[PDB]
Amino acid sequence: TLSSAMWFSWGVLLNSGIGEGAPRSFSARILGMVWAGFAMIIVASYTANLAAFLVLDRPEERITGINDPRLRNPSDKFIYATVKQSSVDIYFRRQVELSTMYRHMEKHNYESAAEAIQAVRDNKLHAFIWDSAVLEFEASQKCDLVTTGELFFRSGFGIGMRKDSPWKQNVSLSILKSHENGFMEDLDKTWVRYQECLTFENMAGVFMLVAGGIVAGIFLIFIEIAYKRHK
């Protein structure tokens, strides 16, 4: 009954309830009950630790805004982006603190708008500064990236003209009327409004072990039969 007792002790910790071991000594039974209680406490502690790790799993500390201390202080771990050195770079030049921070991206500014996103998708860079509309559309359509932070330097777009041309008043009035007409919202809905966008691996990294054990059970049974037949 030694083998049966060992199997029973192994199965007690897994709530099997085999009940194949009844030690003669009362002190042995008391020690077994104490060990079962210790195992229950240990498995409860393990479940609590797993739950806490799942709840507090957050090693991401991405820079939020420009005023973030990590973003404020330059570092050689990763570099920034400037997108062709236009529009935004003037804003960075105007501010003295931004002028100091501009030393990082002064020598590393790109020359286009899609090259930077391609390089980001190549994992050669994780940073970008550009108009909120373009970045938001890129995030929505390409379901691979996310934009985090607070908006700053809010300044709308606009149709440009020259000096004082004879079409300014009518064009501006038409734009305002199109705003108040509901046409612009309809157009923005029809152009950029809809662009596409218990773990499986938790049941995959454990079901593979179950399948392996099921496969090896036949071999173990054959080995036990061979051992019994040999003696």
């Binding site: 991405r62 908006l151 709308g156």
Partner: peptide, 16 residues
């Protein structure tokens, strides 16, 4: 000289 804007936007730093 510009006109009245037809959009409104910020900067919204982007990372992978």
């Amino acid at each position: 000289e510009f006109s009245k804007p037809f959009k409104y936007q910020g900067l919204t730093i982007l990372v992978k």
